[PDB]
Design a protein around this ligand. Structure first.
Ligand SMILES: CCN[C@H]1CN(CCOC)S(=O)(=O)c2sc(S(N)(=O)=O)cc21
Ligand SMILES: [Hg+2]
Ligand SMILES: [Zn+2]
Length: 256
C-alpha cells in the first residue's frame, strides 16, 4: 500500500488515486515574484487559546497530535476563508537531511520540515462531510528551519519515544499549539489538495511567509521514528514528503 519508498512512493500514487494527476494538486512551488499581491485579503484569525489536545499517534506515515474538535475551541477564520475552520490535528513532513523535508518550496528552496495544522469547515457538520467539498479544509503550513530550539516543540519531541512504531499512541493533553507559530502571520494562499492519499482537492492552503526555527537535535528525534509496526523490520521515518506539483492555471495570492 502507499508510502514514500521506491516501490510505493509518490510516483506510483496515481495508480490507486487517479486524482494525483489532477488540476489543483499540492504542494506547489511558491514563486515569490509572480505571486499576486491581493489587497482585499483580510488578516488571519487564529484562536488557539482554548485548544484541547488529546493524543499523539504514529500512523506509519507521520505522527499526528489530535485535538478535540467537537466545539469551537481552536479555530481559524479570516484570511481567504469564508467560514470558521476548526482544528482537528497537526503533523509534519521532514527529511533525512536538513536541506529537504518541506513539501511546499519557496522559489524552489526547500526547508527541513513543514508543519500542517489541519482545519475543516464547520458549515459541513463533521470532518468526513467537509472532505467531500472544494472548500472543506484549510491547512495552515509553516516551514521549519534548523537553528535554535523552538521551546514549544520540545514537549512533542520528548514523547516520541513512546510512539516509535506504526500504531502506537500516547495521551498528550494540554499541549498549546500557539507555541508552534511564527511572529508574523503574513501568507500566500492558493487552492490545492491533501499531499497524501486520498489526494482530494478540498484544501485552501495558507502557507506562512515567516518560518519557525528548531534545533538540529529537535528535528533529529523526528528521524528516529519508524514507518513499520513493532516486530517488523525497522524502516526509519524520513523523507515522508511529496514533491511539488504543476500549478497549472492557479494563481498564488500574497497578503503582503
Ligand atoms: C496519512 C493520511 N493523512 C491525511 C489524513 N486526512 C484524512 C484524509 O482522508 C479523509 S487529513 O485530512 O487529516 C490529512 S491533511 C493532509 S496534508 N498533508 O495535506 O495536510 C494529509 C492528510
Ligand atoms: Hg473535496
Ligand atoms: Zn501534511
Amino acid at each position: 500500500h502507499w508510502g514514500y519508498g521506491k516501490h510505493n512512493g509518490p510516483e506510483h500514487w496515481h495508480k490507486d488515486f487517479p486524482i494525483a494527476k489532477g488540476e489543483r494538486q499540492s504542494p506547489v512551488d511558491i514563486d515569490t515574484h509572480t505571486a499576486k499581491y491581493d489587497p482585499s485579503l483580510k488578516p488571519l484569525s487564529v484562536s488557539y487559546d482554548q485548544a484541547t489536545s488529546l493524543r499523539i499517534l504514529n500512523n506509519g506515515h507521520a505522527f499526528n497530535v489530535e485535538f478535540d474538535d467537537s466545539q469551537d475551541k481552536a479555530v481559524l477564520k479570516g484570511g481567504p476563508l469564508d467560514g470558521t475552520y476548526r482544528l482537528i490535528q497537526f503533523h509534519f513532513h521532514w527529511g533525512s537531511l536538513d536541506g529537504q523535508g518541506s513539501e511546499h518550496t519557496v522559489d524552489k528552496k526547500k526547508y527541513a520540515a513543514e508543519l500542517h495544522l489541519v482545519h475543516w469547515n464547520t458549515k459541513y457538520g463533521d470532518f468526513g462531510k467537509a472532505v467531500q467539498q472544494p472548500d472543506g479544509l484549510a491547512v495552515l503550513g509553516i516551514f521549519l528551519k534548523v537553528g535554535s530550539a523552538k521551546p514549544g516543540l520540545q514537549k512533542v519531541v520528548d514523547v516520541l519515544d513512546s510512539i516509535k512504531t506504526k500504531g502506537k499512541s500516547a495521551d498528550f493533553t494540554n499541549f498549546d499549539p500557539r507555541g508552534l507559530l511564527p511572529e508574523s502571520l503574513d501568507y500566500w494562499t492558493y487552492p490545492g489538495s491533501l499531499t497524501t492519499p486520498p489526494l482530494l482537492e478540498c484544501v485552501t492552503w495558507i502557507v506562512l511567509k515567516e518560518p519557525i526555527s528548531v534545533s538540529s537535535e529537535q528535528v533529529l528525534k523526528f528521524r528516529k521514528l519508524n514507518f513499520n509496526g513493532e516486530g517488523e523490520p525497522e524502516e526509519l521515518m524520513v523523507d515522508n514528503w511529496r514533491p511539488a506539483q504543476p500549478l497549472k492555471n492557479r494563481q498564488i495570492k500574497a497578503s503582503f
